[PDB]
Amino acid sequence: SSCQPGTTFRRDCNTCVCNRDGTNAACTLRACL
């Protein structure tokens, strides 16, 4: 992931939070369908 460190964003129906150096994200594991 290229993201703003510590920002919240969405992948489909999932909440993601960007890691401390903006290179990855942890996201919720909902089934969106």
Residue 24 phi/psi, 5° resolution? Answer: -165, 170
Q: Count Cβ atoms within 10 A of the Cβ of residue 16 and give its class: 0-12 exposed, 13-18 middle, 19 or more buried.
A: middle
Model resolution, angstroms: 1.8
First to last CA, the chain: 23
Please name the residues in contact with 2: beta carbons below 8 A apart, sequence gap of 6 or more: 22, 23
Number of domains in the chain: 1
- Asked if 33 contacts 16 with a C-beta cutoff of 8 angstroms, the reply is no
- Asked if 24 contacts 7 with a C-beta cutoff of 8 angstroms, the reply is no
Residue-wise DSSP of 1-33 = ----TT-EEEETTEEEEE-TTSS-EEE------
Residue-number span of the structural domain to which 33 is assigned: 1-33
CA angle 1, 15, 13 (to 5 degrees): 105
**Dist. CA 33–CA 17, nearest whole Å:** 22
Q: By what technique were these coordinates determined?
A: X-ray
**Dist. CA 23–CA 32, nearest whole Å:** 24
For the record, the structure tokens of 27 come out as 């996201």
Tokens 């942890």 map to which residue?
A: 26
